[model samples]
Target chain A: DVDECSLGANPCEHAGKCINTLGSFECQCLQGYTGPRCEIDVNECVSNPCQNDAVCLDQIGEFQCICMPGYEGVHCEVNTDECASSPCLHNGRCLDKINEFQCECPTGFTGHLCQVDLHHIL
Target chain B: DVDECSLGANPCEHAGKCINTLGSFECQCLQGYTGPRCEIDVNECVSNPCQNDAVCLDQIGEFQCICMPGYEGVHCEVNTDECASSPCLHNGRCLDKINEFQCECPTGFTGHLCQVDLHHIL
Candidate 1:
C-alpha cells in the first residue's frame, strides 16, 4: 500500500517550506514572496502599479495605494467623477470620497444617496 | 360610545351561542356551524371532495377529507398517480400509497425516487 502522507515526486522550489497532510502537501512561501514557489520577492513600488495620481507605499509584505482627488479603483487606477452619472436627484450636491461618492440632499429630502424626499407621502 | 352589547345584536347565527366580552362580543359556533357570527353552516356531504375513492368522515364542528390510494391534495380533490410523472428512473418500480408514492429500485441503486445508481462508476 502506498503511504498517503508521503510527498509526491514534485518538490517545492526556492527555499519554500513544504508540509505534508493526510492526502496532500502545501508549499509555504516567505513574506513578500509569491508564485508556485518562493522564488522572487514582490517589488510593488518598482512596478509603478498605482495609477490616477495615487501615491504608492511599499511595506514589508504588501503595498498600499492611496488615491488622489477625483480618482478611485483597486490600485487607484481609474479616475472617478462624483457627478458624472448624476445619481442624486432633487437638487442634491455630490461629495466625492476616496473610492466612493455621497450625495447631500436639499431641504425636505433625506437618504443615503439623497434619491428620496423626507416628507413626501408615497 | 355606541353600546354594542346592550341591545343583544344577535351576533351569533346558525344555532350558535353568543357571549358578551369587554367592548366586543364573541360567537360560539355549534355543531356544523363556523365563522365569527356563525352565519355559515358547514355542509359535510356536499361535492364529494375526497379523491381516489377515499372515505370522508364528518365530525361535530368540521369535516375531514381522507385521501385514497395514490392521491393527495388539500381537499383530496387532485388525483395523484404514483407512476404518472416518472419520478422513479433506472428501472425502478413505483408503489402508490394513500397520500404519497414510493419507489422500489433495483440492486445497487438507492435514492428517494430511485434515480441514482450507487454502483455505477461515473
Candidate 2:
C-alpha cells in the first residue's frame, strides 16, 4: 500500500514546507513573507510597484493597482483619456463618460455603440 | 371598326351546328338526350352499374363516382389500416401522431423506431 499522506518530495522554495494529503499536497509559507512558495518580500511600499497616483492593495496571490482619474495603462505609466479618439461612427455624436464614450445617433438608427445606419439596405 | 370576330363569340357544342361570330349558340347532347336544343338525359347507369359503396355525382353532360379512403374498388367501400402491422422494432414505445407512427427509443438506442442499440467500448 502506498502512503498517501507521505510527501513524495519537498517541492516548495524559500523556507516553504509541503504537506501531503490523500492525493494532493499543500505548500505553506514561513513567517514575515506570505505565499505558497514564500518567494514574495514583505514590504508594502517597496514590494508594490504601482506608480503615479495609484492605490496598491495586497491580495492572496498578488497585489492590485487601483488607478486614479484620467490615468490608466499598465502600472499607471501612461495617461489615457478613456475616450480619446472617439470610437463612434456614422454621424454619431460622441459623449465622453468617465472611462468610456457614448454615441448619440441622429434619427432612425439605434445602437448603444451607434456603428450602423438607420435606413441601411441589406 | 371592331370586327364581330374581335368582339369574341364562337359557339357550338357536342358536334352541333355553329353560327359564325355569334354571341350565343347551342349544344347537341349527341345520341344521349334528345330535345329541340339537344339538352336531354341518357340512361347509361342501367347498363354499367358501380359496385360496393360508391356514390355517383352527375353533372350537366357527364357523371362520376369517387372512391372513398382505403378501398380502390369501382365503388368506394373498404377499411384498411396503413399501420396494421407494427413496423417498429426493439422495446421502443410507439406513438401514432398525425399521419404516421413514431418510435421512442431509450438512451443509446436509435432507429426508425428505436431498433438499433449504440454501445461504447472501454
Candidate 3:
C-alpha cells in the first residue's frame, strides 16, 4: 500500500513544494518552511530577509547601516573640492559623468588616469 | 576565398573598383566619389572649387558651370554688354569690349567722355 503523503488537508507548511507522484503527494517546504505538514513554527522574518526595514528587505545576503551619497573608492562620494588634492595634473580640469569623474587633460597627456604622456618628455 | 567584388554586388560603377578588406569592403572611387563605401558623389561643389567666380554644378559623370558676377558668356569667355545707355557722359559714343567699355567723345572733349568739354569757358 502506498504511504499516503497526501493523508490529510495538512500536507506541507509555509509555502511547501507540493508534488503528486506515483506513491503519493510529496511536500518540499519552501519559504519560512518548517513543518511536517504545515504544523511547524516558522520565522516570518525568514521570509522577509532584509533587516533594512525591520527585516526590511534591501538584500539577499548582506546589509549596511548608513550608506551615504558616495564614499571613497565609491561612486561620487567625493566633493568638488576633493579635486583640491590636485587630482588633475598638467592643469587638467576635473569633470564627471555623475557616476564617474575625470580630468580634462591639457594638450599631450591622456588616458583615464591621465597617465600616458603623448610627448613622452622628461 | 571571399569574393568582395561580387559580395558588394559589383558596387563599382563605370570606373569604380571594389575591394574587400578582411570583413568590410572598400570602393576605389573613380575620382570624385566619397562615402562610407564610396556610394556618394563628393558633390564637387561643397567646397566651391569653381574659382569663386563660377558656380560648380553636379553631373552624372561630369560637372556643370555658370559664371559669377564680373564675368560673362559660355564658360565666362565673352564680354557682356558692359556699356549701358549713355555709358559715357556728354553725348559720347560707347564701345563695349570684353568686360570693359570705351567711349568716343566728340570734338573739344576728352577724358573718357565728351564731358571734358575743351570748349568750356574759363
Candidate 4:
C-alpha cells in the first residue's frame, strides 16, 4: 500500500490528517474544515451571532464582532453606561442615553454640562 | 357738539383716547390695541417668531417664548451645546449634540463617558 499521508498524494486539505487504509485513503478534517478532502471552510458568521447591529466576520472556527458606537462585548451585546461617571456638573440630573448623556440643569443653572450658573450671570 | 369721551359712549376701547372732531369722533388706539375701536388684541404669535419648536404666547404689547428642551434666547433661537464642559474622561473625543453629548472612547477606554479603562479590567 502507498503512503497517502506523505509526498504529494495527500487527499486532505487545510492540514487534515490523511491515513492510508489498505487500498484507499481516509481524510480526517480539522476543527474548522469539512468535506471528504477537508475542502470546506466552516462559516461561523452564518448564524448572525453578533448583537446590536454589529458586523460579523467569519474566521476559521470562530467569528469576530465589530461593534457599533456605544456598545461593547464579545458579541457587542452590552450598551456602555454613559452616566456612570456623572458627567453633569453642579446639581444637574444626568440622563443616560445611547453613547451619550444629557444634563437636565436645575432652575438656577444652565449649559451643556450644567456648569454655568444663571443666577450669578443674570 | 357732544362730548363722546365722557361716560360709556366713548367709541374707543382698552383705554384708547377718543377725540371729538366736529360732528364725528376719532378713536386713537393704545400701544397694544388695534382696529377702529381698539377692540382687537394683536396676535404676536401669528408671526411665529419662536424658534426650535418653542411655544409663543402673545402678551399685551410683546410676545413670550416658552423654550423647548435645550434651547434659550428671546425666541428660543439658541441650541444648548452639551459638550461645553468636556464631560468625556480619559482624553476621549466629545461630540456635541442637541441637549446631549457623546464621548468617543479611546482605544483603551470604554463606557458612555469613557470613564472605564479596558486595560485595567481585562
What does candidate 1's lDDT look like per residue over B1-122, in tens digits? Answer: 34444576566887677777776778888888878888777777576766555455555566675554345675777766656787787888888743356677776565567655545431
Sliding window of 10 residues with minimal summed lDDT for model 2 chain A: A1-10
lDDT tens digits by residue: candidate 2, A1-122: 34333535556655677676555555687654666556675654466578765656555445666565445666776666645686766777888753445676665444555554535431
Error of 1 at B11 (Å): 96
Model 2: TM-score, first chain: 0.37
Better of 3 and 4 by TM-score: 4
lDDT of 4 by residue, B35-120 (tens): 87899999878889999766677888789876766788999999888898989999999998676677877776666687766564
Off by over 4 Å in 1: A1-28, A34-41, A84-122, B1-122
What tens-digit string does per-residue lDDT give for candidate 3 at B55-76?
5556654555555434654355
What's the count of clashing pairs in each model shown?
0, 0, 6, 1
**DockQ of each candidate, alpha-carbon based:** 0.00, 0.00, 0.00, 0.07
Report the CA-based lDDT of candidate 3 relative to the real structure: 0.54
Query: If the candidates were sorted by their lDDT against the true structure, best first, what order would they fall in?
Result: 4, 1, 3, 2
Global fold similarity of model 2 (TM-score): 0.23
lDDT of 2 at B91: 69
Docking class of 3: incorrect
Task: Identify the runs in model 3 with alpha carbons over 4 angstroms from their true place.
Answer: A1-122, B13-15, B51-53, B60-62, B68-100, B104-122
| Weakest 10 consecutive residues of candidate 4 chain B by summed lDDT | B113-122
Which candidate, 3 or 4, would have the higher DockQ against the true structure?
4
Can you write out model 1's per-residue Cα lDDT over A1-122, one digit (the tens) per residue?
33332536435555567766655566687777777555677777788878865566666567777665456676987767656787778878888654456777776565556555544431
Span of ten consecutive residues with least summed lDDT in model 4 chain A: A113-122
